[PDB]
Amino acid sequence: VKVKFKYKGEEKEVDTSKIKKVWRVGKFVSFTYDDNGKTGRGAVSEKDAPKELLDMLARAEREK
DNA sequence: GTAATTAC
DNA sequence: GTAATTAC
Numbered sequence: 001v002k003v004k005f006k007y008k009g010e011e012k013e014v015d016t017s018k019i020k021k022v023w024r025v026g027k028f029v030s031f032t033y034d035d036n037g038k039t040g041r042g043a044v045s046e047k048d049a050p051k052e053l054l055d056m057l058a059r060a061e062r063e064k
Numbered sequence: 065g066t067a068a069t070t071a072c
Numbered sequence: 073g074t075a076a077t078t079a080c
Binding site: 005007008026027030041042043045047 | 079
């Protein structure tokens with residue numbers, strides 16, 4: 001499942017297998033991901049987030 | 065400005 | 073400490 005989003009004006013697609021930290025900010029979901037040698041950042045509205053990303057969020061919230 | 069949390 | 077992210 002690819003999460004599609006624009007960040008710093010750049011269009012990106014990221015496989016969920018590369019997504020790491022996921023958290024909730026207001027009505028959007030923010031996350032980090034492995035971006036070949038560096039850790040990237042991205043965010044999408046909760047209403048546009050794919051189910052798998054929402055489940056990663058649920059799991060990260062329980063970890064606390 | 066705040067909301068969470070980060071890379072820079 | 074800034075800029076980034078969607079909404080309020």
